[PDB]
Swiss-Prot record, chains A, B:
This is Major capsid protein. It is found in: Virion; Host nucleus. The chain holds residues 51 to 99 of 1381 of the full protein. Belongs to the herpesviridae major capsid protein family. Self-assembles to form an icosahedral capsid with a T=16 symmetry, about 200 nm in diameter, and consisting of 150 hexons and 12 pentons (total of 162 capsomers). Hexons form the edges and faces of the capsid and are each composed of six MCP molecules. In contrast, one penton is found at each of the 12 vertices. Eleven of the pentons are MCP pentamers, while the last vertex is occupied by the portal complex. Homomultimer. Makes the hexons and eleven out of twelve pentons. Interacts with triplex proteins 1/TRX1 and 2/TRX2; adjacent capsomers are linked together in groups of three by triplexes, heterotrimeric complexes composed of one molecule of TRX1 and two molecules of TRX2. Interacts with scaffold protein; this interaction allows efficient MCP transport to the host nucleus. Interacts with capsid vertex component 2/CVC2. Interacts with the small capsomere-interacting protein/SCP. It comes from the Viruses.
């Protein structure tokens, strides 16, 4: 006469990449080139209308 | 002079079995022959968050 263990079950998670989501439509990724910019502030960006 | 029975009729029995009904859609049936020898069952899940 016995008792049983009828099975082990474990979740598997599927990782999400940022670019696979549609949210990347709103923002544009770029290389970490902040060193060329000085004082971390954005460049003048002269605009003429 | 006479009286004569017109006919004798019997019902033919109708059998229903579990696997053919739609209810079986809910279950997964494992034929476990010597079940009476079983004390307790167990299923252990691990879920990592």
């Amino acid at each position: 006469k016995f008792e049983v263990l009828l099975g082990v079950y474990t979740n598997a998670i599927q990782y999400v990449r940022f670019l696979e989501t549609a949210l990347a439509v709103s923002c544009v990724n770029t290389e970490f080139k902040d060193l060329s910019r000085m004082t971390d502030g954005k460049i003048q960006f002269r605009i003429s209308v």
